[PDB]
Enzyme design. Structure first.
Site, short mmCIF file in Angstrom:
data_model
loop_
_atom_site.label_atom_id
_atom_site.label_comp_id
_atom_site.label_asym_id
_atom_site.label_seq_id
_atom_site.Cartn_x
_atom_site.Cartn_y
_atom_site.Cartn_z
N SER A 40 103.66 5.56 22.51
CA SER A 40 104.44 5.90 22.21
C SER A 40 104.07 7.28 20.91
O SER A 40 103.74 6.58 19.76
CB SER A 40 105.39 5.66 21.57
OG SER A 40 105.87 5.44 22.85
N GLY A 41 104.71 8.31 20.75
CA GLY A 41 104.10 9.27 19.73
C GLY A 41 103.14 10.16 19.43
O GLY A 41 103.35 10.96 18.95
N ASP B 64 113.39 13.21 19.17
CA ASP B 64 112.84 12.43 18.62
C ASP B 64 111.26 12.92 18.33
O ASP B 64 110.09 13.16 18.95
CB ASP B 64 112.20 10.91 20.30
CG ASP B 64 110.80 10.12 19.92
OD1 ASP B 64 111.58 9.87 18.07
OD2 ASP B 64 110.97 9.23 20.76
N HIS C 153 111.48 7.86 16.41
CA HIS C 153 111.47 5.76 16.83
C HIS C 153 110.29 5.56 17.04
O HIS C 153 111.15 4.08 16.59
CB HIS C 153 111.70 6.33 18.40
CG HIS C 153 110.75 5.66 19.30
ND1 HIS C 153 110.41 6.35 20.42
CD2 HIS C 153 109.72 4.67 19.63
CE1 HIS C 153 109.06 6.41 21.02
NE2 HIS C 153 109.02 5.35 20.66
#
Ligand code: 63C
Ligand code: CA
Ligand code: NA
Lengths: 43, 234
Positions: B185-186, B88, B42
């Protein structure tokens, strides 16, 4: 392996991740460089 | 990272940071080898173009060890969709190899079956990144880390407005104000076994940040160990 991870230091018959080699005893893992995967770095 | 503390020198070496066209950080990543970064699918949408920065601990100052890398190939999981946030995950191949040094070293990838029984059953793991220090506040200028307890899948499903799939797992706290947040995130979620850290999750999503009754959601790496392996062999 269901007990004390078969007395392994990594993957369990023990074994290790790339950049490591299994020690003579066949339980500990030995780093082959100054920056092996998974270890915090020291100055 | 809401709560937690700052990573000390050499403590979070596998951390990477994706920077946009304004040279601003917007997601994390995990160093897997000299050529590959692990991140969330994402994040690929949040910027028209980006580079990867390794070795940084303070984004407001240029300290020795920082280096920028251009991305050569983006490998996004074909089943990812914003509808469910499932699958994801993405792998990035850098144009030039990373030089390992103080604050720059890879996290280890485990073997599937062993990870399911020996790592996922641990009590905790570690998450890190430069994200917000509060749900609606600013991003942290310093690299932070936080210990998060693994959370029962069924308790998590009950607390969530959205579907929790087998490609995800939950971690964090019910009411204590510690959790990952926008900006993280990530990034990596790693689990310590004996004295080696293994990558177990990818910071994925959460309803708000550190909210009461809500947990942090992570992409379950053990479910994609074969996908990662194939992806890294081009
Ligand atoms: C302001 N923000 C803080 C939230 C966060 O990033 N927290 C956060 C906290 C903890 C951790 Cl681990 C990671 C992220 C961001 C967000 O709202 N995330 C968000 C919420 C829900 C889904 N979702 C789930 C399933 C299906 C569809 C679907 O849209 C996807 C999302 F991106 C905005
Ligand atoms: Ca810096
Ligand atoms: Na909570």
């Amino acid at each position: 392996c269901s007990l004390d991870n078969g007395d392994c230091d990594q993957f369990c018959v023990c074994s290790c991740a790339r950049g490591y080699t299994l020690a003579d005893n066949g339980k500990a893992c030995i780093p082959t460089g100054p920056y092996p995967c998974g270890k915090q770095t020291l100055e | 990272i809401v709560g937690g503390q700052e990573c000390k020198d050499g403590e979070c070496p596998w951390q990477a940071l994706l920077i946009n066209e304004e040279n601003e950080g917007f997601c994390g990543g995990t160093i897997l080898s000299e050529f590959y970064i692990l991140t969330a699918a994402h994040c690929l949408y949040q910027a028209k173009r980006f580079k990867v920065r390794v070795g940084d601990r303070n984004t407001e100052q240029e300290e020795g060890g920082e280096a920028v890398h251009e991305v050569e190939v983006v490998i996004k999981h074909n089943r990812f969709t914003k509808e469910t946030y499932d699958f994801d995950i993405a792998v990035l191949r850098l144009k030039t190899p990373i030089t390992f040094r103080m604050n720059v070293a890879p996290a280890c990838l485990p073997e599937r079956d062993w990870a399911e029984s020996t790592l996922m059953t641990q009590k905790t793991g570690i998450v890190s990144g430069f994200g917000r220090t509060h749900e609606k506040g600013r991003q942290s200028t310093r690299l932070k880390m936080l210990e998060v307890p693994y959370v029962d899948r069924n308790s998590c499903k009950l607390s969530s407005s959205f579907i929790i799939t087998q490609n995800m797992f939950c971690a964090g706290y019910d009411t204590k104000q510690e959790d990952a947040c926008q900006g993280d995130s990530g990034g990596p979620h790693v689990t310590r076994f004996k004295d080696t850290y293994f990558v177990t999750g990818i910071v994925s999503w959460g309803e708000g940040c550190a909210r009461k009754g809500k947990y942090g959601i992570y992409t379950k790496v053990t479910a994609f160990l074969k996908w990662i392996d194939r992806s890294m062999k081009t």
